[PDB]
Design a protein around this ligand. Sequence first.
Ligand SMILES: CC[C@H]1OC(=O)[C@H](C)[C@@H](O[C@H]2C[C@@](C)(OC)[C@@H](O)[C@H](C)O2)[C@H](C)[C@@H](O[C@@H]2O[C@H](C)C[C@H](N(C)C)[C@H]2O)[C@](C)(O)C[C@@H](C)C(=O)[C@H](C)[C@@H](O)[C@H]1C
Ligand code: HEM
Length: 391
Amino acid sequence: VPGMADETALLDWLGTMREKQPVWQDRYGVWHVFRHADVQTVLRDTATFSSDPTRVIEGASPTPGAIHEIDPPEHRALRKVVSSAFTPRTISDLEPRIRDVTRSLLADAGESFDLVDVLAFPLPVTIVAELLGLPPMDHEQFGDWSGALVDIQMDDPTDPALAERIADVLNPLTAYLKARCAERRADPGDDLISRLVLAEVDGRALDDEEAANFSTALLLAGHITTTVLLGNIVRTLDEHPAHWDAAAEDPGRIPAIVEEVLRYRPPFPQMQRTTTKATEVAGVPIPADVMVNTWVLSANRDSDAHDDPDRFDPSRKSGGAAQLSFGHGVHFCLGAPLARLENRVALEEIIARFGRLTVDRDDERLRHFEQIVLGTRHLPVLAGSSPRQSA
Ligand SMILES: CC[C@H]1OC(=O)[C@H](C)[C@@H](O[C@H]2C[C@@](C)(OC)[C@@H](O)[C@H](C)O2)[C@H](C)[C@@H](O[C@@H]2O[C@H](C)C[C@H](N(C)C)[C@H]2O)[C@](C)(O)C[C@@H](C)C(=O)[C@H](C)[C@@H](O)[C@H]1C
Ligand code: HEM
């Protein structure tokens, strides 16, 4: 399998798999699914395709409060704890603050800067920290913890030792959040941690383990992908720069750009399930108790789903609930309205200040993530025209 960092090679490979081997078993006994229709089938059928990886990891037991790894009927009660925090009306109230953070961060940039260090990292981490009621002094901790997680040594995703390694890398974060949970129990505010520690799920409060693990999932979910998307947006516009001008003339076009970048370059290009029973996808027999890898990236480029799938085209009618890059079915991204707002406001503010940004391809800081996510660790950019220029 080509690594994430060589996008062209990876896309080439996925394309031949869609044609020649749409359901593929790898050397670890992991089963890969490449076509859009088949990815939807898998994601919709939660009884057959569990979100709990521990089923196939010997020695590992389910992680209490890990919403992303919990199946119906328990899933719905846990999601109901936080879903009201994430409604479009409630999220829309965050626009002024998102814009204030973005504008201030960009105002001090200069005309040559790393988009990630300046804005794509600090914006989403501030917004999710503020959602969870955590302090600014803790942002650097979160970036260190997400970075280590993203670069964890990893090959066979069913290895018991990988599960232990993840646990160890996230131990400091979960411990920190456990302390913050105990703190909010005593002195609640109206942040997300307060809501989760005071909630009653199926007749009782979440225990300390559950609440910390749920907090951990919310924190990680809330920044890594948003950071990656913003980078992917600027990098994709740089490859199709006629769109900078069009968005400057009509900023109403920015949400369509955001949707099309999501399709074209999903931050999270693959997700795993486990089979609860013997099943078949596209007539290919898959046994019980194995791990399944759904390639969102391959689904998004499938010509049966999207005409001329390798063309970047904001005029595509796709988006909303049909945005596969936010998942599909019961686990569909709780943060979607928020991700969409942060990225809309970021691009508006970039265009307002600079008109356009050019990616500096000769700057050595430009490096792709090698695994797990689809994007760049840093994106050195050059300003088109900035308020700093003078006679
Ligand atoms: C809450 C929803 C979000 O969920 C999370 O953020 C979870 C808390 C992470 O779970 C962690 C921690 C733990 C203890 O869970 C209880 C563990 O049992 C699982 C397996 O790993 C998440 C799944 C991570 O992904 C996984 O990493 C692993 C290191 C490798 C996995 N694969 C490639 C094999 C990969 O699939 C990661 C990095 O955070 C993905 C991020 C960046 C992402 O793009 C998606 C969109 C993410 O935001 C949502 C999915
Ligand atoms: C552009 C950025 C984002 C992308 C691409 C993205 C993507 C995804 C995807 C693909 C899933 C489903 C994973 C699966 O089915 O296993 C998911 C779930 C989730 N996301 Fe997002 N996300 C983004 C931003 C956010 C933000 C800002 C938040 C706010 C905290 C958030 C919170 C969550 C939560 C809590 C879940 C779990 C939902 C559940 O399991 O019921 N995400 N996300």
